[PDB]
Design a protein around this ligand. Structure first.
Ligand SMILES: OCc1ccccc1
Length: 202
């Protein structure tokens, strides 16, 4: 159970300095969506920002020194106005999440079954620990109420990265230092994603 039921409630309860909405609009068919950025799901801000070099980006970040968990709003409740605008303006959505787990794992779901399966094969071939989630899996992200699915097509890829995988990409795993300690494994991962996105969306 999240602390807030929707963005209007979070905005009325939290100091505006303690979160940030960040957008990059390029006209790319694909939107990179990270609604749990900053301290909420650590490392999702950095993966989103690197992919935004080629793709449109929506980022919601928790910027508290601690207690960013209160800023988590589940995808089916996430209705921040700039997110509703940007998802509606794009053909396809890749949505970035973190979940709690020490082992290195990437769970791939979403409504775009063909591209989710292709992404898992490319990650596995490239030596990353990806599994495809199917429609009855809890992390599937197939709800029409899911922010990632409110696009022109309703086709999404949901990328859920374990704590262990996210911690593997940074010298220092802090709000302050992830963005300036990205390692060789961070660029190898984002290169596989750039390779996949250029090929899979034409
Ligand atoms: O310069 C960042 C970047 C890396 C790989 C592909 C596209 C862009």
């Amino acid at each position: 159970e999240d602390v807030y039921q929707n963005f209007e409630e979070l905005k009325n309860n939290e100091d505006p300095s303690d979160y940030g909405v960040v957008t990059k609009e390029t006209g790319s068919p694909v939107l990179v969506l990270a609604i749990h950025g900053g301290g909420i799901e650590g490392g999702t801000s950095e993966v989103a920002r690197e992919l935004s070099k080629e793709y449109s980006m929506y980022l919601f970040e928790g910027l508290k020194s601690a207690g960013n968990s209160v800023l988590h709003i589940t995808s089916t409740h996430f209705d921040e106005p700039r997110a509703l605008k940007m998802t509606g303006n794009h053909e396809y959505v890749i949505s970035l999440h973190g979940y709690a787990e020490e082992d290195q794992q990437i769970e791939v779901g979403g409504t775009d079954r063909v591209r989710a399966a292709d992404l898992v094969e490319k990650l596995q071939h490239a030596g990353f620990p990806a599994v495809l989630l199917n429609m009855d899996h809890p992390h599937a992200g197939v709800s029409p109420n899911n922010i990632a699915n409110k696009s022109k097509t309703g086709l999404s890829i949901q990328i859920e990265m374990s704590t262990g995988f996210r911690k593997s990409l940074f010298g220092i795993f802090s709000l302050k230092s992830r963005a300036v300690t990205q390692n060789e494994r961070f660029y190898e991962f984002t290169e596989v994603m750039f390779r996949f996105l250029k090929n899979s969306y034409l």
